[PDB]
Design a protein around this ligand. Structure first.
Ligand code: AGH
Ligand SMILES: *[C@H]1O[C@H](CO)[C@@H](O[C@@H]2O[C@H](CO)[C@@H](O)[C@H](O)[C@@H]2O)[C@H](O)[C@H]1NC(C)=O
Ligand code: NAG
Ligand code: MG
Lengths: 202, 97, 245, 275
């Protein structure tokens, strides 16, 4: 490939700045584009630059270009959760529609919440119109990871962040459930690295 | 195939047997550019031949000058052989005294 | 972005059967593209066009065909659906924009799942699980958990509606639905979502919470021969009222 | 009294996989440059081939020509897919300028396909020729999308070329106005009769190209004298063959007259038969 992006993937906390790189061997060189692609959606155009331009801005996205070293970077200012996407570098060899577009592999950026006050706790929710459940692992920080189930009849979900905008409060949560009536919330995330000070219900 | 080569064979200086001279072949009015031009001595290809860069005239037809140093005699026959898409077979134009 | 369309947004069809994906544009851009993208993977160019009756082949090899009989329409066809065609398909156009450069405009994309049989298609069952009492006396916050189970294909849109109005705050849904039986080929899927509201807002009896799952399935042109209801594109809900005690 | 610079390009596409691009430049009649498909750079054929242009300015053009060649080749290939044209393909370019007295200069960029004009560069943009097929419109559409190229062609035609030719005209001054005297001899061609004779007046070795040759009886011209094409010699001098098919016999008292600038009106006269 004549377009290479670094890194392949990276994980950052919110409110941080980061820089994604793009190198190309394409010649002749007309223009370079940055695309943001959210999983399950078409790429959305962030920037386009020509050889005579060293910088371009679109909100918290600043693309720089150095035509001598066939090098671009995308600097993301003050990362938020919605920045979690694939970032695509694409170069064109013609100023017209007659040319090739060279696509980078894409850089998968994940933005996790910087949880200030962690109260890691497993809970047990009652079922609304049916009996008799769901275990909610919640309020852990982004250091803790959730491993999937070994057993076929047990279902453990990946960690997900909700943003309570008004209260300005973010929290990770992962959900476990099972068909077997014996299933207990105490053994639910046994295959995951739980923190020691984790609260359990009764 | 569009335009047939016009071939003209001539010497730089007036021909004198035993005296060194140049044999010129000028192929022109042809299109397209893909052509083969050979200078013959007694019907056999001369290998020591230089040529001008393929060029073209105002009407876009192509022209080439092929040339070699040579000493003419009485019994040595000289010719120019051109093959081209417009020709059914190679065309030979002999050099006339 | 907004001036290029793809229908349907989601598509499920049986193996062997013919497939046509609609890509259109209201602009008059000659230059148009079809991409194929498996989840996680890169964008592979499968077809491109310079205008009508132009149908060039892309970088990636494909048994799909395209047709350009109108400027504004670029239908893609697969004459015989097979499971390996399961992927995302992205349409694109090129034309002038805010400056003197020709730029790409990507359509929203079509998600295609080729199944072995249509009897494998099932609508989701949906349940809402009401907050743990221990959470309310500990965090002073309440988490509502929603579960969508037993659906195939994983063509699903989930939303929370508080008091008849859709909310996004304190909400989050798994990016990927997981397989209920990770060994079967056309395994059914499950998906969960969390809506978190304050302990106060939960304990009010007047408040109404609905978890909505928009399922994409079969249409009028699909044949159905089984006793159970035809698993057409449908909404399945679960609801819970606020509770003080 | 004028000397156009003509940059000439021949490009051949046998199939999607086999091509060549060669070129050359003429200042009037003299070839100043050569550029072969297998060469990295354009070649300077005269010691004065660079004009007043500096090494860096020449290298700038060198890089431009380098990128142009590879990009042209690929654009034609892709146009071929688009316009459903069958190989083989023949493309030629005639580009350049001429510096006129005082101030002005006209320039040109014409392109031909399978021997015929299809489009040119007019002012700022690519323009089809009057009798070009409709598919040519489609190519113009796409070419005219490329803003950088349209500007670059402008810079070359309006700026670089006239500056360049001005340096060449100065730098090759002596070689351009040089005079080399011709040599003429008579011969007898194959008989077109009987009883008709074919008389031949050969003139070779003259420079520059413009010349006057005719068969005459005394001071009277022989209408019927067929002059030939003015033919190139390898040493950049020229050759000519004027024929006359006359009956008999008489004349006999017939004379070939050669007029060149070498050669200040002191014409070379040759009488039949003195050969
Ligand atoms: C021209 C007069 C100046 C000469 C001055 C004196 C020099 C000394 C004499 C030596 C001469 C030697 C003989 C050489 C004869 C060749 C004459 C040709 C002139 C050179 C033209 C230079 C064009 C430069 C622009 C160019 O290369 N374009 C490139 C690159 O552009 C790309 O890269 C650029 C940056 O590198 C930009 O990013 C751009 O947006 C992107 O698209 C672009 O790709 C152009 O399309 C290339 C072709 C241009 C001419 C096409 C005209 C005919 C085409 C019609 C064919 C119809 C098809 C039918 C099947
Ligand atoms: C004239 O010059 C072309 C450009 O250098 C040649 O094309 C090249 O062919 C080689 C194959 O050996 C490739 O590796 C290279 O990338 C390029 O395409 C072309 O063949 C040549 N033509 C003739 C007449 O030999
Ligand atoms: C194309 O080019 C030449 C004919 O000039 C031939 O030798 C070659 O095999 C042809 N076919 C290709 C390479 O597709
Ligand atoms: Mg149009």
């Amino acid at each position: 490939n004549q377009v290479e992006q670094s890194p392949q993937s990276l994980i950052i906390l919110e409110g941080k700045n980061c820089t994604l790189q793009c190198n190309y061997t394409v010649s002749p060189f007309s223009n370079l584009r940055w695309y943001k692609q959210d999983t399950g959606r078409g790429p959305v155009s962030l920037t386009i630059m020509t050889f005579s331009e060293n910088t371009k801005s679109n909100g918290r996205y600043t693309a720089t270009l150095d035509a001598d070293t066939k090098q671009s970077s995308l600097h993301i200012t003050a990362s938020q959760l919605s920045d979690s996407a694939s970032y695509i570098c694409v170069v064109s060899d013609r100023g017209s529609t007659l040319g090739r577009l060279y696509f980078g592999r894409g850089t998968q950026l994940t933005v996790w919440p910087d949880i200030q006050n962690p109260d890691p706790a497993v809970y047990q929710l009652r079922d609304s119109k049916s009996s008799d459940s769901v275990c909610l692992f919640t309020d852990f920080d982004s250091q803790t990871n959730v491993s999937q189930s070994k057993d076929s009849d047990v279902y453990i979900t990946d960690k997900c962040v909700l943003d309570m905008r008004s209260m300005d409060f973010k929290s990770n949560s992962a959900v476990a459930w099972s068909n077997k009536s014996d299933f207990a919330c105490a053994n639910a995330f046994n295959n995951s690295i739980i923190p020691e000070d984790t609260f359990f219900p009764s | 195939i569009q335009r047939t080569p016009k071939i003209q064979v001539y010497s730089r200086h007036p021909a004198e047997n035993g005296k060194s001279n140049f044999l010129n072949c000028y192929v022109s009015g042809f299109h397209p550019s893909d052509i083969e031009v050979d200078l013959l001595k007694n019907g056999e290809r001369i290998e020591k031949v230089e040529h001008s860069d393929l060029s073209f005239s105002k009407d876009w037809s192509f022209y080439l000058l092929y040339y070699t140093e040579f000493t003419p005699t009485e019994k040595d026959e000289y010719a120019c052989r051109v093959n081209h898409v417009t020709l059914s077979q190679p065309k030979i134009v002999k050099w006339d005294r | 972005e907004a001036d290029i369309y793809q229908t349907p947004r989601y598509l499920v069809i049986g193996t062997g059967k013919k497939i046509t994906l609609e890509c259109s544009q209201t602009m008059g851009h000659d230059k148009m593209y079809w991409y194929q993208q498996d989840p996680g993977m890169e964008l592979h160019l499968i077809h491109y066009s310079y205008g009508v009756n132009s149908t060039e082949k892309g970088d990636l090899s494909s048994e799909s065909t395209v047709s350009r009989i109108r400027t504004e329409h670029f239908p893609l066809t697969l004459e015989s659906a097979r499971p390996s065609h399961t992927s995302q398909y992205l349409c694109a156009s090129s034309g002038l924009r805010d400056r003197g450069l020709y730029e790409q405009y990507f359509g929203p994309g079509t998600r295609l799942t080729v199944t072995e049989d249509l009897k494998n298609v099932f609508p989701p069952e949906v349940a809402v699980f009401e907050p743990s009492e221990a959470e309310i006396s500990h965090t002073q916050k309440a988490t509502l958990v929603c579960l969508a189970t037993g659906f195939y294909p994983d063509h699903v849109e989930l939303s929370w509606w508080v008091n008849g109005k859709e909310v996004h705050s304190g909400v989050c849904t798994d990016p990927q639905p997981l397989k209920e039986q990770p060994a079967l080929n056309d395994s059914r899927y499950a998906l969960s979502s969390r809506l978190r509201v304050s302990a106060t807002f939960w304990q009010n009896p007047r408040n109404h919470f609905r978890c909505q799952v928009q399922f994409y399935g079969l249409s009028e042109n699909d044949e159905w021969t089984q006793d159970r209801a035809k698993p057409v594109t449908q909404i399945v809900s679960a609801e819970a009222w606020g509770r003080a005690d | 009294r004028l000397f156009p610079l003509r940059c000439l390009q021949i490009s051949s596409f046998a199939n999607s996989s086999w091509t060549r691009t060669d070129g050359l430049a003429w200042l009037g009649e003299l070839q100043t440059h050569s550029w072969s498909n297998d060469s990295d750079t354009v070649r300077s054929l005269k010691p004065w081939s660079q004009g007043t242009f500096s090494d860096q300015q020449w290298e700038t053009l060198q890089h431009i020509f380098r990128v142009y060649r590879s990009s042209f080749t690929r654009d034609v290939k892709e146009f071929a897919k688009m316009l459903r044209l069958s190989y083989p393909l023949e493309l030629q370019v005639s580009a350049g300028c001429e510096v006129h007295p005082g101030n002005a200069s006209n320039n040109f960029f014409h392109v031909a396909f399978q021997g015929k004009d299809i489009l040119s560069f007019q002012g700022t943009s690519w323009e089809p020729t009057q009798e070009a097929p409709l598919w040519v419109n489609l190519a113009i559409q796409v070419l005219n999308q490329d803003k950088w190229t349209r500007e670059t062609v402008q810079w070359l035609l309006n700026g670089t070329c006239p500056q360049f030719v001005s340096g060449l005209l100065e730098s090759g001054k002596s070689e351009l106005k040089k005079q080399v005297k011709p040599k003429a001899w008579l011969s007898r061609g194959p008989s077109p009769g009987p009883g008709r004779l074919l008389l031949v007046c050969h003139v070779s070795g003259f420079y520059p190209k413009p010349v006057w040759v005719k068969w005459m009886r005394g001071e009277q011209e022989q209408q019927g004298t067929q002059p030939g094409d003015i033919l190139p010699n390898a040493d950049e001098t020229w050759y000519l063959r004027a024929t006359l098919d006359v009956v008999a016999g008489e004349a006999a008292g017939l004379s070939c007259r050669v007029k060149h600038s070498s050669l200040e009106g002191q014409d070379i006269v040759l009488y039949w038969h003195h050969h």
